[PDB]
């Protein structure tokens, strides 16, 4: 009975580093995607 | 001294341009006074351009075919207007360029009448609604997403999946079809192939014609030797036939290889011509260029003819994104999905089909009544049997209904399963989703269930005909026919033994 | 006087001007195509000034064919559309010409476009409360007069019949007359939509505008200006409160990001254009109400990615009120508004606007609800026979509570036959006052299906 | 005598597909994805996982079985390589039986334009005219595609997003028609395809991809397992 | 700027005046927005330093 | 320069601060951009390592004159990859560092140890 | 290319010579510093090709 809730309490701290991480991934590229983008468009008008 | 000027323009035996300079595919060509957007102009060497960029002082130029030729001090001649394709109805069971010539070793072709390529759609004013029974041959396909004609339906997958046996299989379904009389039935179904090694063109069109549906059926291939103009141009030509096709009242299918290397084509063009680019390096215009040729198919109006056309563009996604562009702008510019899963064909199902995700909107609509009343939501079903093995994977106690409709849901998603290669007719996929429904097959052990259900369908065929014929005269299930496939289904499994297994009642 | 096209690159083209005959920025430039096959008429506006008589235009159509040194006119005046009171009687997209013929003329009255909001001096001091039909949506989601609210969901969730029964239901009850912009609207659910309206015998009183995606990005960036002009002309024309329809903004700023990007400018804020705030704000100050008349707009945002934090939806957000959701286990559930109580709100649920009684009652019917969510596991797991009594009577009561919350609509008669009631709040919120004390657990599931007001309901109920 | 290194592609109207069990002694290769006899099979992987050796052990057990002569060209590898296979080959009495041509990274980029149409065009020669099977051996496609890219950059067009050259895919068309066996006559090509960091987004091996029909590829996480074959089961495929 | 110069005229007077700056990001992108428009080169984030 | 000429002339040690000299390389970015001189990468100077070296060895001690100096620098965005900080990680003998996270603790010297380097 | 050539003397002498780097990046970052005040083109990430 006690062996139960460890597993159940388990699952439910494990949801949010599931949406943390993923909202960090998202944020980084989105980052990196901006970025480079942004410095192709300086390569090409400095020309 | 305006005058002097007015007459010197007004004053414009053949006229000649100049070209001034060449390289990588493109060239630029001085001298003409006055031309139209997109002549097609002619080379002195016999090779073939159209005209995209227009300047003060020069005028730019795509050379489709051959290039190594293009040098200084050619001349370019202006001839006649806007290249447009000569369209007929020879064109079945055969090969043919991009621009319409005959490719294959099969003699020159004959011509009926040219159609231009730019040509605007049909207004908003000359449609219906949708609603006809195109079939598919795939259980789960019509099962879930129903197709109707006049209605756009995107595939899009991931590498490796199995999307070119699905279109050839649906390709070939129509034989029967094809051998009814009246053109009703008739659908005159063509293939546009791009950017494809010609060996795979080789192998897709060998299994077309053992298949036997070489009669009514045409491709438009654009193998890789090619240049840009051919990759860019071949989806217009393909749109073009298919819609003089119609405009005569015949049923049609266009089917799309892929989009993404027009894509890339138009891109390398673009970029080639010196043109701002934008996110991703792509041009700006890229989602207007595919409203200009998705945008064609639409159920007509019986005033018109009553005409129909149905697309099916291929999309392919690498690592499993969604979020990209070209994705992204296609999946907003249609409606109706099917996604395939890389994970369902590594094991399990063949077909592959998700279910979660995939979605119609037209649904009941396309419908046919007995098999819509078969339907019985197993959509729903199946995602609580879903949501039921996430919990249950370890479970060894469980309320009754919980183990009942576990195991329904285990023997249906093991009955959906399907080879490839075959088509199936209505009337049987309509008997297996009745057995399915109607929990006959509980008893049947899960690990030989598919193989089952062959054999009853073949004595289905054997001993007896006259459901079939109920079936396809008023489409409709009526209790006394299910009253007989009860008792047949029940005389056959009283017999039958896979492997230590029990007839019960 | 006349001009001469110089160079043509896609859609932009050049034109040159005489010294004295140089126009003004938004102007209407008129010119043909001579080839037979591809006959039509060349409409084009003014955006640029690059000097030398040298101007840089849109065209608003495709082009194809066109040739150099081709004569164009001017027309003299910014883009006009046509107002009236034969409006509303028929279909026709920016341009103005009706597709189903083109029997309507230049008869009505003529107007620019482009406007200017109002003064600061004097706009509406105070708000108003907005009062609809449907209690749930007053009771949990306040409307604001002359605001902008959001909605989301999808295909089969029951939006196009809410929209239509919101239709019918402004006509009819403080009258007046709505208009239906669509952007980026697919042809098929066009035709679909307006075969929808005709049998529904309410487009009479409509204004259906629409935008073809085959059109390049002008019609697409301009046909929800001139829905908003029209729809200023019918509210300072006829006095009477209008009802504003869109169906996306998100295209609206991709065309806005492709016309800025076709103009040769520098991209920035990932792949957007410099300023779309300003043309957001532009768009947005000439909704909000003033002079006693209200101006009530629905629009329906898409999210890209599942990201909250794209400058575009953040830009969006900034002028927003309300958000509505839907969702399909409330639809299978089998109510009809198919709206989670949990997943919206509203910014003018005060305690000191709206009453304290009607705070203190939305707030016991959340945690009633909240409860029976949290609860939902140990009832899938082990049921409600090993609760408590407190545990199964809150269950029986939010049950009970949520059949209660569907109301029966009017146009549902097409599937039912009984037209739908409008209900006072006081009615309401007492019966939700007395609904809170849960006395009426004693009633069959049956009975709870919500038809108008208590007295019918309770008569139904004894007579089952 | 002398042929031009710039040819035609063949004729699609003598296009067939071959279909044939040729079978070699190791077992993954064996049951996972059986090769072809006239057809494509490429190789993939990371820095360093271990395909030299792989490509070795192939030519060296299947050239002692084959009756037909062998070409091998490479596009860019260390000189120490090069020396061992020559000196490994110099052992054996089958050196005889093939030919050889490679080109070195120290040499500008210029020369690494044309080893792989060079090595084509005595492939197109010896096959067209004396009618045998033949082997046609690649290292490496990755090198002449940056040094592609390198070029465009240094003539002034614009690159594409990821920094390619545009037009890249046309260049890759161009050069894998020229391996294609016609109904009378037959050819094999070996070649094997280095990713950048091993990531599989870049359009670059996804646009090589397509043009193979049954692949094999490598993984590092395997590698450093322990085992030495280092073949990832789940992705690799075949068409047979 | 003009805030900032009419609190300065009194802050020579002596005495004290407070000062709010309920939007500052806003004026940032205006900044940006004239720069790109400028056609200077944009910096990090296609802010100018 | 004044610094150097008590060190030199007097022949005394000398101590020497200094504070935020990234503010000093931000300033050069700046008026690069003025000039007309290629960018760099994230928008810097098309050189910065030869300013920031020359700086730095212009501080050094004689045999007969000891100088102890003691800078602080500035990190922008709380990114450690940016080249301000790379190029002067390689002029340093002793260092130490500081956190959000630490700070965020409690402990006032919020000091990282796994990160502090020394060389002595 | 100092270090090399001075290794190369003794390599073809038949003298066994070792040689190591401190560092290589460095070398890239002036090669970088030089190329684009030539005003050369710019790649990938500001690197010339
Ligand atoms: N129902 C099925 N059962 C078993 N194998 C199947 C089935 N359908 C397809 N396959 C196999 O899956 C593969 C599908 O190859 P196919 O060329 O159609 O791939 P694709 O995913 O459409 O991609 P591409 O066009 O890039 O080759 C083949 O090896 C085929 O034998
Ligand atoms: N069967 C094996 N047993 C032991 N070592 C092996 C085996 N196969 C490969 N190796 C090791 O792998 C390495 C072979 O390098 P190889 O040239 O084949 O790699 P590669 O994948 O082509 O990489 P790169 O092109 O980066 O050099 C050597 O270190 C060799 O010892
Ligand atoms: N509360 C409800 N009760 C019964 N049927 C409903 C309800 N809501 C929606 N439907 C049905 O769902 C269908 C789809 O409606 P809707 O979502 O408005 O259109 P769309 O699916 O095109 O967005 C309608 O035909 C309607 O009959
Ligand atoms: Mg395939
Ligand atoms: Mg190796």
Same mark, same amino acid.
């Given at each position: 009975?006690?062996?139960? !809730?460890?597993?159940?309490?388990?699952?439910?701290?494990?949801?949010?580093? /599931?949406?943390?991480?993923?909202? *960090?991934?998202? !944020?980084?590229?989105?980052?990196?995607?901006?970025?480079?983008?942004?410095? /192709?468009?300086?390569?090409?008008? *400095?020309? | 001294?305006?005058?002097?000027?007015?007459?010197?323009?007004?004053?414009?035996?053949?006229?000649?341009?100049?070209?001034?300079?060449?390289?990588?595919?493109?060239?630029?060509?001085?001298?003409?006074?006055?031309?139209?957007?997109?002549?097609?102009?002619?080379?002195?060497?016999?090779?073939?351009?159209?005209?995209?960029?227009?300047?003060?002082?020069?005028?730019?130029?795509?050379?489709?075919?051959?290039?190594?030729?293009?040098?200084?001090?050619?001349?370019?001649?202006?001839?006649?207007?806007?290249?447009?394709?000569?369209?007929?109805?020879?064109?079945?069971?055969?090969?043919?360029?991009?621009?319409?010539?005959?490719?294959?070793?099969?003699?020159?072709?004959?011509?009926?009448?040219?159609?231009?390529?730019?040509?605007?759609?049909?207004?908003?004013?000359?449609?219906?609604?949708?609603?006809?029974?195109?079939?598919?041959?795939?259980?789960?396909?019509?099962?879930?997403?129903?197709?109707?004609?006049?209605?756009?339906?995107?595939?899009?997958?991931?590498?490796?999946?199995?999307?070119?046996?699905?279109?050839?299989?649906?390709?070939?379904?129509?034989?029967?079809?094809?051998?009814?009389?009246?053109?009703?039935?008739?659908?005159?179904?063509?293939?546009?192939?791009?950017?494809?090694?010609?060996?795979?063109?080789?192998?897709?069109?060998?299994?077309?014609?053992?298949?036997?549906?070489?009669?009514?059926?045409?491709?438009?291939?654009?193998?890789?030797?090619?240049?840009?103009?051919?990759?860019?141009?071949?989806?217009?030509?393909?749109?073009?036939?298919?819609?003089?096709?119609?405009?005569?009242?015949?049923?049609?299918?266009?089917?799309?290889?892929?989009?993404?290397?027009?894509?890339?084509?138009?891109?390398?063009?673009?970029?080639?011509?010196?043109?701002?680019?934008?996110?991703?390096?792509?041009?700006?215009?890229?989602?207007?260029?595919?409203?200009?040729?998705?945008?064609?198919?639409?159920?007509?109006?019986?005033?018109?003819?009553?005409?129909?056309?149905?697309?099916?563009?291929?999309?392919?996604?690498?690592?499993?994104?969604?979020?990209?562009?070209?994705?992204?702008?296609?999946?907003?510019?249609?409606?109706?999905?099917?996604?395939?899963?890389?994970?369902?064909?590594?094991?399990?199902?063949?077909?592959?089909?998700?279910?979660?995700?995939?979605?119609?909107?037209?649904?009941?609509?396309?419908?046919?009544?007995?098999?819509?009343?078969?339907?019985?939501?197993?959509?729903?079903?199946?995602?609580?049997?879903?949501?039921?093995?996430?919990?249950?994977?370890?479970?060894?106690?469980?309320?009754?209904?919980?183990?009942?409709?576990?195991?329904?849901?285990?023997?249906?998603?093991?009955?959906?399963?399907?080879?490839?290669?075959?088509?199936?007719?209505?009337?049987?996929?309509?008997?297996?989703?009745?057995?399915?429904?109607?929990?006959?097959?509980?008893?049947?052990?899960?690990?030989?269930?598919?193989?089952?259900?062959?054999?009853?369908?073949?004595?289905?065929?054997?001993?007896?005909?006259?459901?079939?014929?109920?079936?396809?005269?008023?489409?409709?299930?009526?209790?006394?026919?299910?009253?007989?496939?009860?008792?047949?289904?029940?005389?056959?499994?009283?017999?039958?033994?896979?492997?230590?297994?029990?007839?019960?009642? | 006087?006349?001009?001469?096209?110089?160079?043509?690159?896609?859609?932009?083209?050049?034109?040159?001007?005489?010294?004295?005959?140089?126009?003004?920025?938004?102007?209407?430039?008129?010119?043909?195509?001579?080839?037979?096959?591809?006959?039509?008429?060349?409409?084009?506006?003014?955006?640029?000034?690059?000097?030398?008589?040298?101007?840089?235009?849109?065209?608003?159509?495709?082009?194809?064919?066109?040739?150099?040194?081709?004569?164009?006119?001017?027309?003299?005046?910014?883009?006009?559309?046509?107002?009236?009171?034969?409006?509303?009687?028929?279909?026709?997209?920016?341009?103005?010409?009706?597709?189903?013929?083109?029997?309507?003329?230049?008869?009505?009255?003529?107007?620019?476009?482009?406007?200017?909001?109002?003064?600061?001096?004097?706009?509406?001091?105070?708000?108003?409360?907005?009062?609809?039909?449907?209690?749930?949506?007053?009771?949990?989601?306040?409307?604001?007069?002359?605001?902008?609210?959001?909605?989301?969901?999808?295909?089969?969730?029951?939006?196009?019949?809410?929209?239509?029964?919101?239709?019918?239901?402004?006509?009819?009850?403080?009258?007046?007359?709505?208009?239906?912009?669509?952007?980026?609207?697919?042809?098929?659910?066009?035709?679909?939509?307006?075969?929808?309206?005709?049998?529904?015998?309410?487009?009479?009183?409509?204004?259906?505008?629409?935008?073809?995606?085959?059109?390049?990005?002008?019609?697409?960036?301009?046909?929800?200006?001139?829905?908003?002009?029209?729809?200023?002309?019918?509210?300072?024309?006829?006095?009477?409160?209008?009802?504003?329809?869109?169906?996306?903004?998100?295209?609206?700023?991709?065309?806005?990001?492709?016309?800025?990007?076709?103009?040769?400018?520098?991209?920035?804020?990932?792949?957007?254009?410099?300023?779309?705030?300003?043309?957001?704000?532009?768009?947005?100050?000439?909704?909000?109400?003033?002079?006693?008349?209200?101006?009530?707009?629905?629009?329906?945002?898409?999210?890209?990615?599942?990201?909250?934090?794209?400058?575009?939806?953040?830009?969006?957000?900034?002028?927003?009120?309300?958000?509505?959701?839907?969702?399909?286990?409330?639809?299978?559930?089998?109510?009809?508004?198919?709206?989670?109580?949990?997943?919206?709100?509203?910014?003018?649920?005060?305690?000191?606007?709206?009453?304290?009684?009607?705070?203190?009652?939305?707030?016991?019917?959340?945690?009633?609800?909240?409860?029976?969510?949290?609860?939902?596991?140990?009832?899938?797991?082990?049921?409600?026979?090993?609760?408590?009594?407190?545990?199964?009577?809150?269950?029986?009561?939010?049950?009970?509570?949520?059949?209660?919350?569907?109301?029966?609509?009017?146009?549902?008669?097409?599937?039912?036959?009984?037209?739908?009631?409008?209900?006072?709040?006081?009615?309401?919120?007492?019966?939700?006052?007395?609904?809170?004390?849960?006395?009426?657990?004693?009633?069959?599931?049956?009975?709870?299906?919500?038809?108008?007001?208590?007295?019918?309901?309770?008569?139904?109920?004894?007579?089952?």
């Amino acid at each position: 009975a006690s062996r139960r !809730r460890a597993m159940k309490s388990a699952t439910d701290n494990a949801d949010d580093l /599931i949406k943390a991480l993923t909202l *960090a991934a998202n !944020r980084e590229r989105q980052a990196q995607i901006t970025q480079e983008i942004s410095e /192709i468009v300086g390569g090409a008008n *400095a020309l | 001294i305006e005058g002097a000027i007015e007459d010197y323009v007004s004053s414009f035996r053949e006229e000649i341009g100049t070209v001034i300079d060449a390289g990588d595919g493109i060239a630029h060509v001085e001298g003409l006074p006055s031309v139209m957007t997109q002549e097609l102009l002619e080379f002195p060497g016999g090779v073939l351009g159209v005209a995209l960029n227009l300047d003060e002082h020069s005028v730019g130029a795509v050379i489709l075919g051959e290039f190594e030729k293009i040098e200084e001090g050619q001349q370019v001649k202006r001839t006649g207007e806007v290249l447009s394709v000569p369209v007929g109805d020879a064109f079945l069971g055969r090969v043919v360029n991009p621009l319409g010539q005959p490719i294959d070793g099969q003699g020159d072709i004959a011509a009926e009448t040219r159609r231009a390529l730019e040509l605007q759609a049909p207004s908003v004013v000359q449609r219906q609604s949708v609603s006809e029974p195109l079939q598919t041959g795939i259980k789960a396909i019509d099962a879930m997403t129903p197709i109707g004609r006049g209605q756009r339906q995107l595939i899009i997958g991931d590498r490796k999946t199995g999307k070119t046996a699905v279109c050839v299989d649906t390709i070939l379904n129509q034989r029967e079809a094809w051998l009814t009389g009246d053109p009703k039935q008739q659908v005159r179904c063509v293939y546009v192939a791009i950017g494809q090694k010609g060996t795979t063109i080789a192998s897709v069109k060998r299994a077309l014609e053992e298949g036997g549906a070489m009669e009514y059926t045409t491709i438009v291939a654009a193998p890789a030797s090619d240049a840009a103009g051919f990759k860019w141009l071949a989806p217009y030509t393909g749109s073009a036939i298919g819609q003089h096709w119609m405009y005569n009242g015949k049923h049609v299918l266009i089917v799309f290889d892929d989009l993404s290397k027009q894509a890339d084509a138009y891109r390398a063009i673009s970029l080639l011509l010196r043109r701002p680019p934008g996110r991703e390096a792509f041009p700006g215009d890229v989602f207007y260029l595919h409203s200009r040729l998705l945008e064609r198919c639409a159920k007509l109006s019986d005033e018109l003819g009553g005409g129909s056309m149905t697309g099916l563009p291929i999309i392919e996604t690498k690592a499993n994104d969604i979020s990209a562009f070209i994705p992204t702008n296609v999946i907003s510019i249609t409606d109706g999905q099917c996604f395939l899963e890389s994970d369902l064909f590594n094991q399990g199902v063949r077909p592959a089909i998700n279910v979660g995700v995939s979605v119609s909107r037209v649904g009941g609509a396309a419908q046919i009544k007995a098999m819509k009343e078969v339907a019985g939501s197993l959509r729903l079903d199946l995602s609580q049997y879903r949501e039921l093995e996430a919990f249950a994977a370890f479970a060894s106690d469980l309320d009754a209904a919980s183990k009942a409709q576990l195991d329904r849901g285990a023997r249906l998603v093991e009955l959906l399963k399907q080879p490839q290669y075959s088509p199936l007719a209505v009337e049987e996929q309509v008997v297996a989703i009745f057995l399915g429904t109607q929990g006959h097959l509980d008893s049947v052990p899960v690990e030989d269930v598919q193989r089952f259900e062959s054999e009853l369908l073949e004595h289905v065929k054997a001993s007896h005909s006259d459901i079939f014929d109920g079936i396809r005269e008023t489409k409709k299930l009526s209790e006394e026919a299910e009253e007989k496939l009860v008792s047949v289904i029940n005389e056959f499994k009283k017999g039958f033994q896979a492997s230590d297994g029990s007839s019960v009642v | 006087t006349a001009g001469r096209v110089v160079r043509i690159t896609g859609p932009v083209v050049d034109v040159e001007f005489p010294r004295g005959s140089v126009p003004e920025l938004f102007n209407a430039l008129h010119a043909e195509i001579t080839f037979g096959a591809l006959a039509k008429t060349l409409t084009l506006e003014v955006a640029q000034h690059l000097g030398d008589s040298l101007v840089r235009c849109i065209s608003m159509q495709p082009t194809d064919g066109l040739v150099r040194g081709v004569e164009v006119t001017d027309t003299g005046a910014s883009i006009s559309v046509p107002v009236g009171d034969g409006v509303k009687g028929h279909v026709f997209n920016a341009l103005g010409d009706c597709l189903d013929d083109p029997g309507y003329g230049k008869d009505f009255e003529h107007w620019s476009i482009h406007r200017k909001p109002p003064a600061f001096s004097d706009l509406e001091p105070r708000t108003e409360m907005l009062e609809t039909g449907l209690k749930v949506v007053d009771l949990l989601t306040p409307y604001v007069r002359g605001g902008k609210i959001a909605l989301f969901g999808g295909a089969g969730v029951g939006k196009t019949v809410l929209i239509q029964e919101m239709i019918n239901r402004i006509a009819r009850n403080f009258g007046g007359t709505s208009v239906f912009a669509g952007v980026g609207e697919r042809t098929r659910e066009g035709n679909d939509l307006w075969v929808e309206l005709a049998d529904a015998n309410v487009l009479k009183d409509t204004a259906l505008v629409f935008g073809q995606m085959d059109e390049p990005p002008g019609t697409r960036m301009r046909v929800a200006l001139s829905a908003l002009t029209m729809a200023e002309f019918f509210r300072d024309e006829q006095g009477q409160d209008v009802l504003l329809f869109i169906d996306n903004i998100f295209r609206f700023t991709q065309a806005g990001s492709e016309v800025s990007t076709l103009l040769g400018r520098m991209p920035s804020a990932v792949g957007y254009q410099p300023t779309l705030a300003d043309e957001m704000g532009e768009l947005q100050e000439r909704i909000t109400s003033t002079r006693g008349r209200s101006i009530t707009s629905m629009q329906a945002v898409y999210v890209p990615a599942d990201d909250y934090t794209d400058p575009a939806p953040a830009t969006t957000f900034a002028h927003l009120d309300a958000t509505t959701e839907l969702s399909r286990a409330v639809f299978s559930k089998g109510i009809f508004p198919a709206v989670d109580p949990l997943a919206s709100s509203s910014t003018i649920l005060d305690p000191a606007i709206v009453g304290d009684e009607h705070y203190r009652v939305a707030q016991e019917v959340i945690r009633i609800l909240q409860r029976y969510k949290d609860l939902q596991d140990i009832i899938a797991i082990l049921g409600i026979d090993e609760l408590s009594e407190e545990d199964k009577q809150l269950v029986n009561r939010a049950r009970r509570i949520e059949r209660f919350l569907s109301q029966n609509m009017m146009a549902a008669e097409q599937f039912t036959g009984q037209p739908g009631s409008t209900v006072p709040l006081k009615e309401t919120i007492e019966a939700f006052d007395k609904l809170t004390k849960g006395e009426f657990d004693h009633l069959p599931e049956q009975a709870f299906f919500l038809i108008g007001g208590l007295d019918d309901l309770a008569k139904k109920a004894e007579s089952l």
